[PDB]
Amino acid sequence: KEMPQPKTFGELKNLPLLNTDKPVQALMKIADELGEIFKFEAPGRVTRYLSSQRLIKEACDESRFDKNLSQALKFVRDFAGDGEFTSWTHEKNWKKAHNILLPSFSQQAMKGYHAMMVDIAVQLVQKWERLNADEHIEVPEDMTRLTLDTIGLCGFNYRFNSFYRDQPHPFITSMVRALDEAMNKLQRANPDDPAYDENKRQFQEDIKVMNDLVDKIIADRKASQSDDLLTHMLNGKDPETGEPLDDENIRYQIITFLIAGHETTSGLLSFALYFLVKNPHVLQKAAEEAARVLVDPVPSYKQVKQLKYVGMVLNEALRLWPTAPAFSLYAKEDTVLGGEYPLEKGDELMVLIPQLHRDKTIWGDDVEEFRPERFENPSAIPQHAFKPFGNGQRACIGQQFALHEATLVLGMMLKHFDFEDHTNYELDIKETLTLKPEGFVVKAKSKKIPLGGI
Numbered sequence: 001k002e003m004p005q006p007k008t009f010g011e012l013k014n015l016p017l018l019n020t021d022k023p024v025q026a027l028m029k030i031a032d033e034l035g036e037i038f039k040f041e042a043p044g045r046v047t048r049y050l051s052s053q054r055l056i057k058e059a060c061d062e063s064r065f066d067k068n069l070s071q072a073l074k075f076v077r078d079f080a081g082d083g084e085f086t087s088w089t090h091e092k093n094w095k096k097a098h099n100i101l102l103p104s105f106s107q108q109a110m111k112g113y114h115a116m117m118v119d120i121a122v123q124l125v126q127k128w129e130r131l132n133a134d135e136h137i138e139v140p141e142d143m144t145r146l147t148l149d150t151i152g153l154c155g156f157n158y159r160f161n162s163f164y165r166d167q168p169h170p171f172i173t174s175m176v177r178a179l180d181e182a183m184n185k186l187q188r189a190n191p192d193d194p195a196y197d198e199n200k201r202q203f204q205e206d207i208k209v210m211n212d213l214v215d216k217i218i219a220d221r222k223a224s225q226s227d228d229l230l231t232h233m234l235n236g237k238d239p240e241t242g243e244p245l246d247d248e249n250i251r252y253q254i255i256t257f258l259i260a261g262h263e264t265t266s267g268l269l270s271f272a273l274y275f276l277v278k279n280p281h282v283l284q285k286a287a288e289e290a291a292r293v294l295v296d297p298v299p300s301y302k303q304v305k306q307l308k309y310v311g312m313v314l315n316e317a318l319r320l321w322p323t324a325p326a327f328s329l330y331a332k333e334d335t336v337l338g339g340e341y342p343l344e345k346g347d348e349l350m351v352l353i354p355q356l357h358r359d360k361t362i363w364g365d366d367v368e369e370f371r372p373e374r375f376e377n378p379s380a381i382p383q384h385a386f387k388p389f390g391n392g393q394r395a396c397i398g399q400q401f402a403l404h405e406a407t408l409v410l411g412m413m414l415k416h417f418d419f420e421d422h423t424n425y426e427l428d429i430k431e432t433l434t435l436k437p438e439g440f441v442v443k444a445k446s447k448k449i450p451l452g453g454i
């Protein structure tokens with residue numbers, strides 16, 4: 001079968017279709033028009049975008065495809081290096097990092113992070129209880145304060161103190177600019193036009209800000225007994241090789257985990273709150289569970305694990321708007337995809353996750369509705385139908401960290417406040433490679449339930 005392909009622009013082929021501030025949403029619209037697979041060509045590069053579970057399940061076969069660095073991740077690698085997110089599976093530092101850092105995500109480790117996650121969640125609840133009657137909440141802004149603070153504290157014993165700042169933390173400002181520039185470089189046909197000189201200067205200055213922060217984390221740790229993610233980065237030995245990470249790689253890991261470890265989580269909490277306010281009956285169910293389950297002044301680790309419906313709400317937000325919305329594969333050898341599409345060794349595929357999650361042959365016709373009951377019995381969901389955390393040995397290492405944090409915080413929010421979508425907010429999804437609502441504001445009325453000490 002010949003592969004569908006969207007409209008072209010002469011010798012720029014499909015490239016100018018990425019000349020938009022919302023490229024993923026543009027690709028989703030193309031997949032809607034063109035179907036489960038389409039080709040996207042740019043000068044000197046081709047990729048194929050997959051949207052159906054039937055083809056994505058094949059792409060998820062690790063004997064035939066391996067993780068690829070999409071052009072977006074190659075640009076991120078300019079500041080994330082061979083950190084765990086932007087390394088190739090065949091690079092020595094990927095498996096060594098994965099082996100050294102995995103223990104930081106064990107259940108025993110998670111039980112150990114719980115108190116520090118509560119410390120930050122209590123700061124969030126206190127900030128909102130302290131608002132005056134005439135004020136409102138800027139949701140994605142506060143969720144980024146919470147999630148950055150939480151990976152800082154749990155992962156690095158470092159306080160960003162983001163709730164002490166009315167503007168974004170300077171790491172956030174540089175990170176966002178750096179991910180923005182990566183996204184913007186995707187549609188640049190001549191990246192070395194001197195018209196991009198100031199883009200390049202500003203990129204370097206952004207990277208220097210992130211690395212100065214990494215310096216402070218490393219120095220604060222030297223000056224400081226912890227056993228956290230940074231402990232394993234600095235001292236952990238890979239059981240296979242017996243070697244620890246080198247200093248250069250360790251700096252890439254800290255940048256990696258500070259970014260990967262909070263940005264997508266902030267997106268998830270923002271979208272879950274959005275869907276809750278837009279679906280009052282769902283919000284009533286979740287708030288009922290939070291009140292029934294969270295009987296103590298602050299939540300315990302077991303209580304969080306008991307918030308089943310809140311967990312379903314977060315999964316159903318990840319179904320509609322997975323906040324790292326694509327991952328890319330390459331063919332290990334020549335092969336035929338779906339019995340219809342021949343690929344040569346090295347050909348790249350991109351999995352368009354929001355489109356996979358709207359495959360009506362899996363989910364039924366009502367894929368746009370927000371229905372957490374979809375996830376009541378997760379074992380009934382077909383393999384490779386639901387993939388917000390990527391695939392196989394390159395799947396997200398921090399998936400349980402993110403879900404525990406989001407479930408704890410959303411459970412505390414729902415216990416402590418009633419929420420009003422006071423402006424009838426129209427969803428506007430800002431892209432910086434990752435997805436988050438922009439402009440989403442709410443009002444929160446305290447239920448005046450006292451909050452225990454940290």
Ligand code: HEM
Nearest residue numbers: 084085260261264265324327388389390394396397398402
């Ligand atoms: C809801 C929140 C999250 C989402 C949706 C998410 C999504 C993903 C996805 C889609 C990938 C695969 C990327 C690819 O194949 O190119 C991935 C990998 C990764 N994520 Fe997450 N992530 C989240 C939270 C986290 C957190 C909290 C951490 C750290 C504490 C983290 C650290 C990582 C790392 C280090 C990788 C690379 C894993 C490897 O290849 O060894 N992520 N994530």
Ligand SMILES: CCCCCCCCCCCCCCCC(=O)NCC(=O)O
Nearest residue numbers: 070071072080085256260324325326433
């Ligand atoms: C260092 C940790 C990095 C954390 C952020 C990771 C970003 C997640 C990637 C999301 C996918 C973005 C898709 C961008 C649009 C697209 O398809 N571009 C084509 C291409 O990238 O080559």
